[PDB]
Design an enzyme around this catalytic site. Structure first.
Site, short mmCIF file in Angstrom:
data_model
loop_
_atom_site.label_atom_id
_atom_site.label_comp_id
_atom_site.label_asym_id
_atom_site.label_seq_id
_atom_site.Cartn_x
_atom_site.Cartn_y
_atom_site.Cartn_z
NE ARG A 120 -3.89 -2.22 2.26
CZ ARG A 120 -5.17 -2.35 2.59
NH1 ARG A 120 -5.99 -1.30 2.67
NH2 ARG A 120 -5.66 -3.57 2.83
N1 ADP Z 1 -7.14 1.89 -8.87
C1 ADP Z 1 -6.07 1.15 -8.50
N2 ADP Z 1 -4.99 0.99 -9.31
C2 ADP Z 1 -3.91 0.26 -8.96
N3 ADP Z 1 -3.82 -0.38 -7.77
C3 ADP Z 1 -4.83 -0.31 -6.86
C4 ADP Z 1 -6.03 0.48 -7.18
N4 ADP Z 1 -6.85 0.37 -6.12
C5 ADP Z 1 -6.23 -0.40 -5.20
N5 ADP Z 1 -5.03 -0.82 -5.65
C6 ADP Z 1 -4.04 -1.66 -4.92
O1 ADP Z 1 -4.63 -2.27 -3.76
C7 ADP Z 1 -4.14 -1.64 -2.57
C8 ADP Z 1 -5.26 -1.46 -1.54
O2 ADP Z 1 -6.10 -0.34 -1.84
P1 ADP Z 1 -6.98 0.38 -0.71
O3 ADP Z 1 -7.82 1.45 -1.36
O4 ADP Z 1 -6.04 0.74 0.41
O5 ADP Z 1 -7.94 -0.83 -0.23
P2 ADP Z 1 -9.20 -0.70 0.77
O6 ADP Z 1 -10.37 -1.14 -0.08
O7 ADP Z 1 -8.87 -1.66 1.89
O8 ADP Z 1 -9.29 0.75 1.19
C9 ADP Z 1 -3.48 -0.35 -3.04
O9 ADP Z 1 -2.45 0.09 -2.16
C10 ADP Z 1 -2.96 -0.73 -4.40
O10 ADP Z 1 -1.70 -1.39 -4.31
MG MG Z 2 -9.05 1.82 3.08
#
Ligand code: ADP
Ligand code: MG
Ligand code: ADP
Ligand code: ADP
Ligand code: MG
Ligand code: MG
Lengths: 57, 461, 475, 475
Positions: C340
């Site tokens: 992340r």
């Molecule tokens: N639009 C995107 N493009 C590329 N990678 C993504 C994208 N969305 C999520 N990821 C990958 O998945 C990880 C988790 O996303 P996050 O938004 O933190 O999840 P959550 O749904 O738990 O909030 C990111 O750090 C990234 O590595």
């Molecule tokens: Mg989150």
């Protein structure tokens, strides 16, 4: 060719007939596993609710 | 009115007051610590024998039985108006940005009844996000309620940050961000990102993150909401309300539930799940006085959409972005479920006859691909008909063209982010359905903006 | 208030009468010298959790207040020592001579105290450093079944910090002590023990010490973080810690929830892992990086405790048995694993060569499964490339690769320099290539060491092509 | 007469005194807020609060009314939006009425009824033909979210326009702006002036969600016992059940499956049995019920779904797979049941629908052969061609309910083979133009079905359709 074609389609009957019998065998095994998990899930869920209620009283 | 602490049980505190001098439910009560400082607690239950059970808004470590507790005579009150803009707050409405005092006009209580039936309306105008999958298959509405559903690490925070980057950047009105029970790193990341872009001046920020005790995570969304409610009702200006993550309100309630003396419900949740959710959610809305466009991240525990928390949340939304891990596991980002994601404004009257037909065409092709996946896996690819083989080929290209590189996710994608207009998105998927890009490879459609960029990418391969 | 009395005791859980004005979560001392922790302040009695042996703590035993919270020793004296969660040495090399101390309970740094994670923590493992990069201040979960290679990743990471000025802390929770003794010897043989603190709460220890072990190890890491130095902490594992907390709660008769765990089991790990952070330049710019462990049962990532810890951390490295036994070691699932922080935790050279690598290999593994059900030219080229890239990401245990050498290996395979080489020769090609680059082309490697950026690609392309003239394929 | 409050919390108050209070009695707190006595215990009265409870404290006084909960009923509620207490929410003044009825009221006995013989036309071809609903029947509408449940109920209500049937839409646990959207849809289609809207939104106290269906039932019963006919919709009983669970758990009644009490089945059975078809001696009026259940991931064997399935006379199962494919309404005909059956249909519909259910069963059974085009024998060839054409007739647009006379001609045309010549994509356009042709020119055939309830001369009808078929232009 026609005789070879008859042998091809006959061989496909047998092979896919076996695959049908094998699928029904596996479908029963999966249905046993499902109903094992369904019963276990309800048993666990209700046990945790009743355990949580007894802790207060 | 003064009281005395008789029990301390984690985040719950029992305080005995004098006869006929009891604080009302939801009243803020201050307790002076032995170490130094003040602890605010909120009255929850009147137990009897003049005892009030209270949920603490900070750590109860260091407290002693017998300490004096003072009734403030009202709920937790927090600053409102333009003094909150550019500032970062905590659950109690105190500044945590280290930039001096907050010279606010008024201080409104965080608790409040929901609006009347007469005050409410529907949200019919489309809101362009610039994200292909959303704008096509489940578009957001202006002044409407948006929910970003997803499991652990599927892309809720990355999506909401992209919606801030796309929508809130060129927004004429004001904004509010509420950090509810999530990572403190992400609050620091977003603050400095909003500071660099200049969006901070339009935005009031509140944070009550997963480091905090449950009571803080329970009431922090109300602190942010009260500021948004001011900008809706009192001032004549549009509001964007970003919440990440609203699930943590429900979880925070679930943490204190058994200590408050409540018997548990299904899946370890509090019995008052729906009532507590509704009394918070129904305040988050547009009215005749003003417009709130609410965008809320919603955690789905164990990737299970049947879980009581996300299941109950579905009733409070006009559009839903349903993230799934299986798409994220392939590398399809944003990992939006093209069938399960829905919108109230997906109809010919709002988006036009062409948009609705193309959007519906995409869903039928992808539905047919899912029906064939289990058949193909065992019995093979060549046993299908020529129609189904063409459907499989186009479905996989459509699924990859639904993916998109984000401005905020350059460090994850390793390429520049792309904004795609709606009319451009509709044109792209229309040409794929008609069969004009059948000779392009699958990777050409993966991680691009427009259909023109897919034609250019195919030459590199 | 002066002195309390044990009215009842059992399973390391005493109940005390007499202590009137005791604080919530206060350290207490029993008559025999063993310490205790007062959990809840009820009206009549006080529930005390015993932090040690409870063989000589009977009814009528005297208890007294200290007026303090639970505390541990910290600093340079712990380096190379094996201690328990209280700080007492188990290796038998004399007492821990130190004046500095820090508490078990301590708040995390706020929103304004942090700076975004921008500095690499190099594990020396290609699969992690390229696709799931860890940065200084990040929390990265290591999750997977038993015997999938979780501990090996943490030990190899610790060994790779040799000479990098990063103080390591290996926290063992619920392990058999002979395995912890074997880990200490492995660190000793690889010369990693000098800068490592070994905290251990073995399976024979009371549950409170297992519960308290990660917070003790966290406190030992926080010392260096707040001084402006950098530190790494490993919790091996949090499944056994949570199980010890469950035992503790059920013995105190607290209300149980899912899988008999208490309502605040998420909160247990959240406040622990929030304390791991990258501090701002204003507060010294130090960091604490966290590697929490979870043991899954039969690959069940969607269980209760695993998904809580996944939801806290800044990504996870998921290991699986089917990958492990098929030859993919380390057995990283590219689809489920994620970082992340991402590119911010990598140097510009790695960021450029491996920026889209995880997404490309995620697409490869899906395409590999679909391809099994005669392909076209562009699709077949993607499978051939991905298959060669998989061989590069394979790596033996205890063989760390410097980041400069990782860049060259990833650069070579991702730009097609191994397309004409057979799949079975890719790993031998890599070893011979890097051996060639170290011996004859070190200025290209050194440019990455000093600047953190790729060298001239024209010169780099020519240097790899020069090596290939002396490579003999087996097929 | 008078009693004082001991404890308050979460919409529940326990009251000292009130010694002669009835079980289920209406109570009044000193500030004007109302309550209901649910638990009579040895030393207190457990009271559920029908309003805000922030001003209710310990020492607050409560008064006996000596009455059960009543609601206003009659013609004054038509066109109005109300809460479960009968108070107006639309902001259009008071509700002037002398007529009142109790919320809890006994259902008609075994001897008070007559067999369900009268159609209640939904205007939806799939429901009216193969899963017919009769006046007095209880038909469950069940399925996951976004399957088209609410639309079916709204289209049914719109179709009652000019049929002398009073409709009642009970909203339980919904977002209030969504309820505002529903009443606007009814207003635009001229459906509101014979409809009563009872809404207990998500922000309302739990007792109002619990009492909402019973309040709406009482409003429907007024017309039933006066000799008229009425329709009640509960949208939905899942959220009503959860609201009753909340109160039971807060009153410490023992939990069972999914934490529900032992009287949650009794709750819904007591509600739904009040919907009935009265005998000639009792006036001949009726109340038709359309309860909703929101399933989770298709789990029809979950507890609350299982209860309401067994209670009702039949089920209209909706599914997501059919909805996403374009089969809308997304009715699964195979598993959907109507135990009343042919008795709830006119003679014309009963005759044509026999072939329709036969043809549609054989199509979805023999759908495995569909991909194998032109390899099949001519017996299964024509049945697939017929089957896919009948699916297109069973498709229907949103808010466009069809008169029964127009349905039977459309079903008659497709089942006897008058659309086999026309292509598959043109079947829906062929239907719309055919009924436009029949309404304008051949109204005598339509009017025969309206008056007699039977099919006209079949050879005359065949001649009328064939004249149109020549004028039609395929594509
Ligand atoms: N639009 C995107 N493009 C590329 N990678 C993504 C994208 N969305 C999520 N990821 C990958 O998945 C990880 C988790 O996303 P996050 O938004 O933190 O999840 P959550 O749904 O738990 O909030 C990111 O750090 C990234 O590595
Ligand atoms: Mg989150
Ligand atoms: N990269 C690797 N190559 C070869 N063997 C490995 C590798 N990583 C781990 N192993 C082996 O796998 C076994 C289990 O490793 P360990 O780290 O103890 O797994 P866990 O902690 O998940 O049980 C050990 O015998 C170790 O030698
Ligand atoms: N027959 C139909 N044709 C086209 N669209 C429909 C049809 N029936 C329902 N819809 C649309 O699909 C969505 C289904 O949701 P809804 O009717 O509210 O069902 P539920 O109450 O189960 O969510 C609505 O937005 C509605 O506009
Ligand atoms: Mg291990
Ligand atoms: Mg609905």
């Amino acid at each position: 060719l026609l005789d070879a074609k008859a042998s091809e389609f006959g061989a496909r009957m047998t092979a896919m007939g076996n695959a049908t019998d094998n699928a029904t065998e596996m479908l029963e095994t999966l249905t046993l596993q499902f109903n094992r998990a369904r019963q276990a899930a309800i048993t666990q869920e209700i046990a945790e609710i009743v355990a949580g209620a007894n802790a207060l009283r | 009115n003064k009281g005395r602490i008789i029990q301390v049980m984690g985040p719950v505190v029992d305080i005995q007051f004098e006869s006929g001098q009891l604080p009302d439910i939801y009243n803020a009560i201050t307790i002076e610590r032995p170490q130094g400082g003040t602890l605010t607690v909120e009255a929850a239950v009147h137990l009897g024998d003049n005892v009030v059970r209270c949920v603490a808004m900070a750590s109860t470590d260091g407290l002693v039985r017998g300490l004096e507790a003072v009734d403030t005579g009202a709920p937790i009150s927090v600053p409102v108006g333009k003094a909150t803009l550019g500032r970062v707050f905590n659950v109690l409405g105190e500044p945590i940005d280290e930039q001096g005092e907050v010279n606010a006009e008024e201080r409104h209580p965080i608790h409040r009844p929901a609006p009347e039936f007469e005050e409410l309306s529907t949200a019919d105008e489309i809101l362009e996000t610039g994200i292909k999958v959303i704008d096509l298959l489940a578009p957001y509405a202006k002044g409407g309620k948006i929910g970003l559903f997803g499991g652990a690490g599927v892309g809720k925070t990355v999506l909401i940050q992209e919606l801030i980057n796309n929508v809130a950047q060129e927004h004429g009105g004001l904004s509010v961000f509420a950090g509810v029970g999530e990572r403190t790193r992400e609050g620091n990341d977003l603050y400095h990102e909003m500071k660099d872009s200049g969006v901070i001046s339009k935005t009031s920020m509140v944070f009550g993150q997963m480091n905090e005790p449950p009571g803080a995570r329970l009431r922090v969304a109300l602190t942010g909401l009260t500021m948004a409610e001011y900008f809706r009702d009192r001032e004549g200006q549009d509001v964007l309300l970003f919440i990440d993550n609203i699930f943590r309100f429900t979880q925070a309630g679930s943490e204190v539930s058994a200590l408050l003396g409540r018997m548990p419900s299904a899946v370890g949740y509090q019995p008052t799940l729906a009532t507590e959710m509704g009394q918070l959610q129904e305040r988050i809305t547009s009215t005749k006085k003003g417009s709130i466009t609410s965008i809320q991240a919603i955690y789905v525990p164990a990737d299970d959409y049947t879980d009581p928390a996300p299941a109950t949340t579905f009733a409070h939304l006009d559009a839903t972005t349903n993230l799934e891990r299986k798409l994220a596991e392939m590398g399809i980002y944003p990992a939006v479920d093209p069938l399960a994601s829905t919108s109230r404004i997906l109809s010919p009257a709002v988006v036009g006859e062409e948009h609705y037909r193309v959007a519906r065409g995409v869903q039928q092709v992808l539905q047919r691909y899912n029906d064939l996946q289990d058949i193909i896996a065992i019995l093979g690819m060549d046993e299908l008909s020529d129609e189904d083989k063409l459907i499989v080929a186009r479905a996989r290209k459509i699924q990859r063209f639904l993916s998109q590189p984000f401005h905020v996710a350059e460090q994850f994608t390793g390429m520049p982010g792309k904004y795609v207009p709606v009319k451009e998105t509709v044109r792209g998927f229309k040409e794929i359905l008609e069969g004009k890009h059948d000779n392009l490879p699958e990777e050409a459609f993966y991680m691009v903006g427009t259909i023109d960029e897919a034609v250019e990418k195919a030459k590199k391969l | 208030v002066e002195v309390g009395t044990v009215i009842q005791v059992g399973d390391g859980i005493a109940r005390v009468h007499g202590l009137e004005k005791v604080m919530a979560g206060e350290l207490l001392e029993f008559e025999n010298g063993v310490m205790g922790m007062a959990q809840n302040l009820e009206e009549d009695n006080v529930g005390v959790v015993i932090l040690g042996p409870y063989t000589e703590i009977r009814e009528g035993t005297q208890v007294k207040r200290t007026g303090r919270i639970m505390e541990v020793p910290v600093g340079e004296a712990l380096l190379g020592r094996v201690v328990n969660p209280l700080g007492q040495p188990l290796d038998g090399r004399g007492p821990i001579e130190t004046a500095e101390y820090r508490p078990i309970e301590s708040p995390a740094p706020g929103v304004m105290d942090r700076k975004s994670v921008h500095e690499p923590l190099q594990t020396g493992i290609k699969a992690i450093d390229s696709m799931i990069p860890i940065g200084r201040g990040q929390r990265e979960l290591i999750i997977g079944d038993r015997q999938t290679g979780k501990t090996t990743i943490a030990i190899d990471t610790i060994i790779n910090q040799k000479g990098q000025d990063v103080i390591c802390i290996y926290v063992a929770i619920g392990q058999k002590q002979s395995t912890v003794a074997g880990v200490v010897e492995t660190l000793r043989q690889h010369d990693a023990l000098d800068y490592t603190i070994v905290v251990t709460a073995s399976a024979s220890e009371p549950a409170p010490l297992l519960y308290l072990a990660p917070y003790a190890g966290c406190a030992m890491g926080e010392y260096f973080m707040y001084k402006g130095k950098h530190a790494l902490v490993v919790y091996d594992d949090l499944s056994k810690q949570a199980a010890a907390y469950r035992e503790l709660s059920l013995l105190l008769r607290r209300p149980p929830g899912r899988e008999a765990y208490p309502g605040d089991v998420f909160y247990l790990h959240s406040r622990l892992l929030e304390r791991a952070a990258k501090l701002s330049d204003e507060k010294g710019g130090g960091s604490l990086t966290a590697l929490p462990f979870i043991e899954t049962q039969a690959g069940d990532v969607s269980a209760y405790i695993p998904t809580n810890v996944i939801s806290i951390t800044d990504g996870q490295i998921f290991l699986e048995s089917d990958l492990f036994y098929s030859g993919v070691r380390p057995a990283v699932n590219v689809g489920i694993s994620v970082s992340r922080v991402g590119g911010a935790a990598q140097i510009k050279a790695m960021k450029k060569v491996a920026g889209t690598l995880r997404l490309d290999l995620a697409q490869y593994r899906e395409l590999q499964a679909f391809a099994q059900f005669d392909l076209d030219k562009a699709t077949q080229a993607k499978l051939n490339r991905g298959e060669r890239t998989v061989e590069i990401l394979k790596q033996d245990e205890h063989k760390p690769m410097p980041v400069e050498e990782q860049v060259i290996s990833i650069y070579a395979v991702t730009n097609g320099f191994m397309d004409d080489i057979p799949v079975e020769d890719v790993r031998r090609f890599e070893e011979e290539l890097l051996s060639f680059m170290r011996a004859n082309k070190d200025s290209l490697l050194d440019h990455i060491r000093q600047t953190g950026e790729l060298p001239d690609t024209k010169e780099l392309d020519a240097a790899i092509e020069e090596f290939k003239k002396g490579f003999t394929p087996s097929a």
